[PDB]
Amino acid sequence: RIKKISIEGNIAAGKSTFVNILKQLCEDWEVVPEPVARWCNVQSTNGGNVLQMMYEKPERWSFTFQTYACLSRIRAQLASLNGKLKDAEKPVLFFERSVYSDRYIFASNLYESECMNETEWTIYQDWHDWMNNQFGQSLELDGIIYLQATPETCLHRIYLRGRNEEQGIPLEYLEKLHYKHESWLLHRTLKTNFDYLQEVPILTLDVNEDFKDKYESLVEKVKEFLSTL
Amino acid sequence: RIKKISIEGNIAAGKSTFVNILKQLCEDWEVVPEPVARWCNVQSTNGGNVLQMMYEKPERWSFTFQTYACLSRIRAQLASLNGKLKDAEKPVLFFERSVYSDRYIFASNLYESECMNETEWTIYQDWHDWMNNQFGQSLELDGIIYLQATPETCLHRIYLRGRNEEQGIPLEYLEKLHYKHESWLLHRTLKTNFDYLQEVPILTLDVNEDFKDKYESLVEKVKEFLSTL
Numbered sequence: 001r002i003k004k005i006s007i008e009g010n011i012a013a014g015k016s017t018f019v020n021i022l023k024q025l026c027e028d029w030e031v032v033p034e035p036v037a038r039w040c041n042v043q044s045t046n047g048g049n050v051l052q053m054m055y056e057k058p059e060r061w062s063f064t065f066q067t068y069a070c071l072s073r074i075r076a077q078l079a080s081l082n083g084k085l086k087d088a089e090k091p092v093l094f095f096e097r098s099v100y101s102d103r104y105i106f107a108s109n110l111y112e113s114e115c116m117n118e119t120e121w122t123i124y125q126d127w128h129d130w131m132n133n134q135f136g137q138s139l140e141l142d143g144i145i146y147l148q149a150t151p152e153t154c155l156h157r158i159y160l161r162g163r164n165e166e167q168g169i170p171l172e173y174l175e176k177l178h179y180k181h182e183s184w185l186l187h188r189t190l191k192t193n194f195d196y197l198q199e200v201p202i203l204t205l206d207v208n209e210d211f212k213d214k215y216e217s218l219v220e221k222v223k224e225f226l227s228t229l
Numbered sequence: 230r231i232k233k234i235s236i237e238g239n240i241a242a243g244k245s246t247f248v249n250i251l252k253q254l255c256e257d258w259e260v261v262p263e264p265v266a267r268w269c270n271v272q273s274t275n276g277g278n279v280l281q282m283m284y285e286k287p288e289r290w291s292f293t294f295q296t297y298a299c300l301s302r303i304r305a306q307l308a309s310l311n312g313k314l315k316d317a318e319k320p321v322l323f324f325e326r327s328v329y330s331d332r333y334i335f336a337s338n339l340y341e342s343e344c345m346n347e348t349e350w351t352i353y354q355d356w357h358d359w360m361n362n363q364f365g366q367s368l369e370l371d372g373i374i375y376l377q378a379t380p381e382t383c384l385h386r387i388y389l390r391g392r393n394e395e396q397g398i399p400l401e402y403l404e405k406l407h408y409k410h411e412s413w414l415l416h417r418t419l420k421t422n423f424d425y426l427q428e429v430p431i432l433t434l435d436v437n438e439d440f441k442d443k444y445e446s447l448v449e450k451v452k453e454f455l456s457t458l
């Protein structure tokens with residue numbers, strides 16, 4: 001009954017900014033953010049900063065981070081689905097990213113960059129497949145909103161936000177991530193193991209311009225898109 | 230309906246040897262071995278040998294191994310419970326170790342030995358807790374059989390078996406593991422997060438003598454124990 005929409009975009013493209021205007025548009029809309037602050041202070045459900053560990057030494061910490069982030073996402077998304085939104089009249093749940101970008105964008109890029117070895121990559125995919133067989137059904141997407149921004153725009157927006165753990169990220173890394181997003185969501189040439197994704201509707205929104213100026217037109221396009229689903 | 234018994238013991242104490250005589254005693258008995266050969270050639274459900282990686286560089290590979298081994302165990306134990314044993318008249322499933330020894334013996338010892346750091350140890354426990362909340366119920370134990378052998382006997386039995394990945398294991402490591410088994414299963418002073426375990430019945434069998442000579446008396450004690458459950 002709940003419609004599920006993933007918001008996808010590169011680092012600092014503006015996913016959280018876009019997420020922060022959604023609830024005011026309709027009482028039956030809910031959001032599941034990525035728990036980025038929790039990845040910076042690991043505590044059981046003062047701790048280690050696993051996001052910082054990955055960026056400081058990615059060949060050591062990528063597998064650990066990638067497994068922890070994706071599990072944390074699944075847990076949060078399931079918590080929202082099984083909560084009070086279940087009761088609303090026209091419920092829509094918006095996710096800040098998906099299990100699909102965790103694997104096909106982030107973890108795949110780190111494997112390709114030799115930050116995971118063959119063993120790590122095999123274990124990660126085996127784990128991801130199993131987690132999706134146990135839960136993929138309830139989290140299946142009805143639509144994707146792709147917030148498209150240049151990697152140079154994203155690099156500027158990392159500076160604007162000032163999240164400590166991201167200040168060292170080089171343009172080269174954001175560029176690699178950009179081309180993976182374009183392959184998946186614009187050209188639709190990135191192959192995955194989840195056949196339904198090749199037909200899921202995608203709304204592409206260019207977010208290179210200032211949000212203050214673009215807001216009204218973005219909202220119009222979102223409401224139109226959601227009326228087709 | 231299925232009774233579940235964990236067989237616990239140190240490395241090379243003789244768990245597999247004991248497991249290999251059980252099915253011939255009763256048609257309704259089944260066993261779930263640890264998939265040790267699979268840990269030596271990692272393949273999705275020629276690959277990396279994650280058991281060897283842990284022993285070659287435990288401060289690098291302990292967390293990865295410990296997470297993979299425990300997931301692989303849970304998957305195997307669930308597969309056996311949900312299979313044809315479900316149909317038998319007096320079904321008993323024997324596990325070669327449990328999720329409890331994965332955490333409280335093996336992973337805890339590696340953390341204590343500084344082979345996992347605080348971040349790794351927090352992530353592992355958080356993961357273990359979540360996996361047990363999702364599955365702990367169906368895998369709950371009715372009894373434990375503890376195959377007790379000296380660490381010196383175990384060191385000799387590693388030599389006898391000749392598993393390549395274990396030939397370098399020092400007596401010091403087997404001794405640490407021995408005292409953890411004794412605390413958990415003999416003195417019953419090792420605290421866990423699973424309250425029912427402090428009352429689960431335990432049969433302790435001394436297996437320092439040759440199996441050929443001890444077999445008949447061991448079988449008698451097992452049949453007696455199982456009749457009390």
Ligand SMILES: Nc1ncnc2c1ncn2[C@@H]1O[C@H](COP(=O)(O)OP(=O)(O)O)[C@@H](O)[C@H]1O
Nearest residue numbers: 011012013014015016017157160161209210211
């Ligand atoms: N379209 C936009 N115009 C101007 N600033 C933006 C825009 N989108 C995001 N920002 C700013 O860029 C930074 C990153 O935005 P954020 O929403 O945290 O990105 P993400 O959630 O995608 O990582 C913030 O400082 C935010 O104010």
Ligand SMILES: Nc1ncnc2c1ncn2[C@@H]1O[C@H](COP(=O)(O)OP(=O)(O)O)[C@@H](O)[C@H]1O
Nearest residue numbers: 240241242243244245246386389390438439440
């Ligand atoms: N009680 C016993 N007497 C003589 N040999 C034993 C005995 N128990 C085990 N062995 C031998 O010790 C080695 C390890 O046994 P195994 O069953 O593989 O241990 P585990 O499964 O506990 O790692 C094998 O070579 C096996 O034949």
Ligand SMILES: Nc1ccn([C@@H]2O[C@H](CO)[C@@H](O)[C@@H]2O)c(=O)n1
Nearest residue numbers: 011034036069101102106107166
């Ligand atoms: N699977 C994932 C998901 C997210 N991340 C990273 O988390 C931070 C916040 O989005 C960003 O720095 C970056 O996207 C990641 O590395 N891998």
Ligand SMILES: Nc1ccn([C@@H]2O[C@H](CO)[C@@H](O)[C@@H]2O)c(=O)n1
Nearest residue numbers: 240263265298330331335336395
């Ligand atoms: N949680 C676990 C379980 C098992 N092991 C190791 O696997 C091998 C076969 O029992 C043995 O070398 C050793 O017991 C481990 O290190 N950690």
Ligand SMILES: [Mg+2]
Nearest residue numbers: 015016034096
């Ligand atoms: Mg965000």
Ligand SMILES: [Mg+2]
Nearest residue numbers: 244245263325
């Ligand atoms: Mg064995």
